[PDB]
Amino acid sequence: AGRISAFLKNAWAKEPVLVVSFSVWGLAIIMPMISPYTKYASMINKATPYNYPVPVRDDGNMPDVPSHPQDPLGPSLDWLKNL
Amino acid sequence: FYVREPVNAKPNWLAVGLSVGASVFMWIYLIQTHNEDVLEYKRRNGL
Amino acid sequence: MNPITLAIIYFTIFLGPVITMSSTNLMLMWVGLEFSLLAIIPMLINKKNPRSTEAATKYFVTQATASMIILLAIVLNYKQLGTWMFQQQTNGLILNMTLMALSMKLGLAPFHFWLPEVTQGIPLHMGLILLTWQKIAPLSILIQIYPLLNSTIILMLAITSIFMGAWGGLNQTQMRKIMAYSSIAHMGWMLAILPYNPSLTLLNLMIYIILTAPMFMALMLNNSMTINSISLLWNKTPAMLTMISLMLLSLGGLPPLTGFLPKWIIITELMKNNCLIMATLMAMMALLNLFFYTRLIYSTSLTMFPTNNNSKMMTHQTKTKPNLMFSTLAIMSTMTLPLAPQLI
Amino acid sequence: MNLYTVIFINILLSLTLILVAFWLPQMNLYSEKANPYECGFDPTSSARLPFSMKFFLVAITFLLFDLEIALLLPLPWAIQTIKTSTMMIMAFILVTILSLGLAYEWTQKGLEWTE
Amino acid sequence: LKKTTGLVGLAVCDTPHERLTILYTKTLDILKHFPKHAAYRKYTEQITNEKLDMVKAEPDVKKLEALLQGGEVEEVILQAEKELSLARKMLKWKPWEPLVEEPPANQWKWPI
Amino acid sequence: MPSTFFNLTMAFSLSLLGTLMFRSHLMSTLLCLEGMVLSLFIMTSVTSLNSNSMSSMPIPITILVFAACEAAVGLALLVKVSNTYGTDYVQNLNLLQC
Amino acid sequence: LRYGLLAAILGDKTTKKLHEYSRVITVDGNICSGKNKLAKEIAQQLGMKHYPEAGIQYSSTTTGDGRPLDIEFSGSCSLEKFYDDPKSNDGNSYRLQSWLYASRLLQYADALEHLLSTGQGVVLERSIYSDFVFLEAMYNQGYIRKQCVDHYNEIKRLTLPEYLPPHAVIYIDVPVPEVQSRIQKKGDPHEMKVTSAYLQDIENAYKKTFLPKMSEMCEVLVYDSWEAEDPTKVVEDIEYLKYNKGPWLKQDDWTFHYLRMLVQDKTEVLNYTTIPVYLPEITIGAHQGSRIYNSFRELPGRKYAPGYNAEVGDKWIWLK
Ligand SMILES: CCCCCCCCCCCCCCCCCC(=O)OC[C@H](COP(=O)(O)OCCN)OC(=O)CCCCCCCCCCCCCCCCC
Ligand SMILES: Nc1ncnc2c1ncn2[C@@H]1O[C@H](COP(=O)(O)OP(=O)(O)O)[C@@H](O)[C@H]1O
């Protein structure tokens, strides 16, 4: 267009502040929606063991991680490394 | 003759169909809702 | 006023109760009293005269102190039995200072001296919001404490609101200071029966809101804030006299009209709970709450005060009264006595 | 305790430096140098009258925002929550309604020095 | 067709050839109430009837300026409505009256 | 903890005892209304901080977003008390009783 | 739609309608000093319309059939009965005047409806603000009590400042021995037999009070009979005029909307004219009024709202 697209041209010459603000506003919410790496923020932040991981007791069930930490089962995050 | 014409010289024909038609929907939903229930009151203890 | 300001302030008003309702925490339930306290003041002050400012200050300072005296009782309760609710075994003066503060939000015993002063010096619109809508959220504090109110001081605040809202309403020519003292009289009925089946105070509120709203809206129609101005109404809109004779003889409860229903079945709940000597002191003084309605419908209806000839123009210019808001609220009251079992 | 050792000092470094300013100048205070200034004349009014500011509305918008600033400050910890999608949105919602609240005042002549 | 005058607070007031004519024609009419022998009426009619002809014949502003000195035409409309305001003052006053009231008492022989 | 809350409850009350006895200023009563809030901030924080009730720690700020928004509406009325009188004395507003 | 508030949001903005000639001009003077060749011919020469003098019977012309009704319905004034017999204990000197204030106000209100929609100017004549001239002329001479002048300036305090000023008033003085001549050369007996002291208190009550207190809120074009009587050069001074110095320019659209809902509701235009200040000149009692209110609704054509009268047409008397 012209009657909208050339209005931005004076608003970029004069008033060259609100254009950045109104852009960075509209450019902030939009980028996490088109990212490859936004999934990890809720995951890198979920891996941190701030509290102690209480172990369950073996009752003939849950073929998960055995009583050994370096055992290939369980949430072995090799994605944080080699990000 | 009302030199300053009334706001209501003609019937606002929407307000008729809004008011007539609404009432006829009320009844038809008020009639069925009773018949639908009395018939359904008669399937819990007896007739 | 600018609609982007109106809608925001007509909506904070819609949040105050609704958050005082849809919230169990006594902190969400507190802020709801404040949304109904911020929002009101911009519309009290629409004229910015020496009557609107003095009311808002007399509405704000009188009513923020109450929001603190409430909030004390939460924190005093947040310590004891740590949570955000008046549970069952909370201390008395926590709640007798809570009920104290609500009585200031509403205006009952000597806490009424701000209500007429504020309900005076104010438009008629925004006289209707205080006495009807600002009153719902404070009661929502006060139905949730269904038991566990001091039956002693909850009841002196009633009688003191029957007296002071009846003795005072006699003097007052300005309708706005009359309806203020009607709110105070009728609250002794809402507030005395609060421990005693408060499905009757939710009633007396929904009745009282149906009585005032036609009245304040019957005064919008000509902006008559004086007996001598509601009098000259047979010349402007004589068609209105048929309701106001009933709107007032009901709002002062006489039996064939619904406004005797709350005053009546309340007393049943009072008699049935062995307080035979209290209800009498009310009902003997609810008759005094007719004398300035008997006298008022005389001056309005049953004797034509001497009008003006400048009022002859008013018999040319075709007003417009609301629709569904007066005819309903004046027949849905004053003619619903036989449907009392449906009410309760 | 370790800070009280820092800061009671600085009061004394100030308080010891002021006592050695009133009791070591050799003063001569009589009448006319104690009286107020106004550039070589006797002041007309009393120096303590209503100023009648003009930025009165902006002082309040600050009074509201100092809360809002305070209402931002827990973001460095909020990112260390496991959700980081309500913290995402609700941080946009707070900053946006602010600018909306700031842009309304910006157009309705709030921060404009009534005159 | 005048964007920005050199002057300040003297707005364009477009549509000249009217106001310059509404005013001069209105001086001629607020004249004719004076005496004919009063020389103010005698002289300012010799002024306006020139300028009125230097507008009633010339439609182009930029050359009209070079006919009635007083360039920046809009500065003339300020003057035309000012003389107009003065004839009214000269009407309620009576300047054409006889030789001076209270002549001077040896008041001006300068060398003392 | 049960030596401050008697001492903070007693600090609330003195401020409640202050914002009911006036001294010819509306702007010292609004002023006494913020120290009233302040004792509730602290007597709420500690209760939420000896009990380790971090889930209630959002509350001592929500109480206080309505300590300034109420002061804001409070301060802004003085602008409309002054512009009638220019003096801000509580004794000067008594023309409602009429 | 009744313009509501939705229409404004939906789009009926008034600044959007304001033309250059969307100016509520007025003209003022004395009782036989132009205004009838001047109010007209400022309208026709500029583009806007013309409201004439609001007599006793303005409200009757804008309502119903527009026919001038009986004197008792439109007041009880009888201007002709004032001149020939003033100072009557049957208060007519003031009934004549409070009724005209109301009708000079309904006139001005009915203008702003039209100024603030389909934007045209309005050419009034002796608008609201030049209505006190008679009273002072009627009070300085003995016709009205001081217990009644207060009733008027009260009403002006309650109705005036809600409205906007007459927006470049016009005036033509004329020496009081001359206006007495135009009356007597105008074959009316009632306007005759008037004191020329009442027409010197008419312009002593103009240039001392009106013209100065209006030359700050609005604009003044003080002319004379000969500067007028050629009504094009009065118009030309209105065209090439530099509008400033008033409340018209320092206010916004939503200042018109709550002035435009103020002015539609004619009941709201007139609430403070009907105040119950019980004066015997203006109080009329019940039996004198109930006889008239009911014998006005018995009129062939009012009887009801302005749209439901089967005796004067109104064919759809049962839906609309
Ligand atoms: C049934 C058992 C249950 C208990 C029943 C209890 C009793 C019923 C309640 C009675 C109280 C209401 C009646 C009192 C109203 C006051 C008097 C009144 O309104 O009339 C006076 C008024 C005079 O005004 P005026 O200017 O002279 O005009 C006269 C004609 N227009 O005249 C008027 O102009 C007013 C009317 C003008 C508009 C026409 C409407 C006529 C009135 C219709 C209402 C009739 C009553 C309804 C039926 C009874 C209900 C049970
Ligand atoms: N209060 C009043 N007292 C006397 N005359 C009045 C009053 N109100 C209106 N009028 C009349 O209004 C008339 C104005 O007449 P004029 O200016 O000649 O023509 P127009 O009626 O068209 O303005 C006068 O006859 C005057 O007497």
Short mmCIF file of C-alpha atoms in Angstrom, two decimals, chain E:
data_model
loop_
_atom_site.label_atom_id
_atom_site.label_comp_id
_atom_site.label_asym_id
_atom_site.label_seq_id
_atom_site.Cartn_x
_atom_site.Cartn_y
_atom_site.Cartn_z
CA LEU E 1 -0.94 30.85 -3.04
CA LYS E 2 1.15 32.34 -0.18
CA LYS E 3 2.64 29.60 1.98
CA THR E 4 4.35 31.45 4.84
CA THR E 5 4.64 35.20 5.18
CA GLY E 6 7.83 36.76 6.43
CA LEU E 7 5.89 38.26 9.32
CA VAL E 8 4.65 36.62 12.51
CA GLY E 9 1.09 36.44 13.80
CA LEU E 10 -0.11 38.08 10.57
CA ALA E 11 -2.09 35.21 9.11
CA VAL E 12 -2.67 34.72 5.40
CA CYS E 13 -6.35 35.71 5.30
CA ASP E 14 -6.78 34.41 1.77
CA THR E 15 -9.38 35.71 -0.68
CA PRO E 16 -7.89 39.17 -1.23
CA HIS E 17 -9.55 41.48 -3.77
CA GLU E 18 -12.64 41.18 -1.53
CA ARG E 19 -11.64 42.38 1.94
CA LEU E 20 -9.46 45.04 0.36
CA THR E 21 -12.66 46.05 -1.46
CA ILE E 22 -15.11 45.55 1.42
CA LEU E 23 -13.05 47.98 3.52
CA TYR E 24 -12.26 50.80 1.09
CA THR E 25 -15.88 50.81 -0.07
CA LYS E 26 -16.76 51.01 3.63
CA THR E 27 -14.50 53.99 4.27
CA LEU E 28 -16.24 55.88 1.46
CA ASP E 29 -19.52 55.14 3.27
CA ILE E 30 -18.26 56.02 6.76
CA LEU E 31 -17.02 59.09 5.04
CA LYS E 32 -19.86 61.24 3.58
CA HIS E 33 -20.98 61.91 7.17
CA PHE E 34 -18.11 64.35 7.63
CA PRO E 35 -18.33 67.81 6.11
CA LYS E 36 -17.24 68.05 2.50
CA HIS E 37 -14.91 70.92 3.44
CA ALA E 38 -13.11 68.84 6.06
CA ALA E 39 -9.81 67.99 4.43
CA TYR E 40 -9.57 64.51 5.95
CA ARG E 41 -12.55 63.45 3.85
CA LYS E 42 -11.05 65.34 0.91
CA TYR E 43 -7.71 63.55 1.11
CA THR E 44 -8.35 59.95 2.17
CA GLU E 45 -10.86 59.60 -0.67
CA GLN E 46 -7.99 60.50 -2.98
CA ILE E 47 -6.12 57.61 -1.32
CA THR E 48 -8.72 54.84 -1.30
CA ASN E 49 -10.09 55.56 -4.77
CA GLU E 50 -6.57 55.01 -6.08
CA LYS E 51 -6.08 51.74 -4.21
CA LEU E 52 -9.63 50.66 -5.03
CA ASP E 53 -8.79 51.12 -8.71
CA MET E 54 -5.43 49.37 -8.27
CA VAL E 55 -7.41 46.34 -7.07
CA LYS E 56 -10.54 46.63 -9.25
CA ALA E 57 -8.34 46.45 -12.39
CA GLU E 58 -5.45 44.20 -11.29
CA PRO E 59 -6.33 40.57 -10.37
CA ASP E 60 -2.77 39.28 -9.81
CA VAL E 61 -1.56 39.85 -6.26
CA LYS E 62 2.20 39.90 -6.89
CA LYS E 63 1.98 42.78 -9.37
CA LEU E 64 -0.80 44.46 -7.40
CA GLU E 65 1.83 44.82 -4.67
CA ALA E 66 3.91 46.84 -7.13
CA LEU E 67 0.96 49.23 -7.65
CA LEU E 68 -0.03 49.94 -4.04
CA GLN E 69 3.24 50.17 -2.18
CA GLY E 70 2.80 48.22 0.98
CA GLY E 71 4.13 44.88 -0.25
CA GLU E 72 2.96 41.75 1.52
CA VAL E 73 -0.67 42.63 0.63
CA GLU E 74 -1.95 41.19 3.90
CA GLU E 75 -0.08 44.03 5.64
CA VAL E 76 -2.34 46.44 3.72
CA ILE E 77 -5.60 44.82 4.81
CA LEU E 78 -4.30 45.42 8.32
CA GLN E 79 -3.93 49.09 7.38
CA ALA E 80 -7.17 49.41 5.41
CA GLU E 81 -9.17 48.21 8.42
CA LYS E 82 -7.11 50.58 10.61
CA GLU E 83 -7.82 53.82 8.77
CA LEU E 84 -11.42 52.56 8.79
CA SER E 85 -11.20 52.37 12.57
CA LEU E 86 -9.75 55.90 12.65
CA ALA E 87 -12.40 57.76 10.65
CA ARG E 88 -14.89 56.56 13.26
CA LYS E 89 -12.64 58.07 15.93
CA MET E 90 -12.31 61.24 13.85
CA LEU E 91 -16.13 61.37 13.65
CA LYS E 92 -16.89 61.34 17.38
CA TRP E 93 -14.01 63.80 17.65
CA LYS E 94 -14.23 67.10 15.74
CA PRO E 95 -10.76 67.81 14.32
CA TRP E 96 -11.97 70.09 11.51
CA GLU E 97 -13.12 72.62 14.14
CA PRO E 98 -11.86 76.23 13.95
CA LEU E 99 -8.33 77.46 14.66
CA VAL E 100 -6.88 76.18 17.93
CA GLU E 101 -8.54 76.49 21.31
CA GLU E 102 -6.30 78.33 23.78
CA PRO E 103 -3.32 79.31 21.57
CA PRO E 104 0.15 79.42 23.14
CA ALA E 105 1.51 82.13 25.41
CA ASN E 106 4.91 82.90 23.87
CA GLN E 107 5.72 79.24 24.17
CA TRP E 108 8.20 78.41 21.41
CA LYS E 109 10.88 81.08 20.85
CA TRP E 110 13.57 78.57 21.54
CA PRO E 111 16.91 80.25 22.37
CA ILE E 112 16.86 81.03 26.08
#
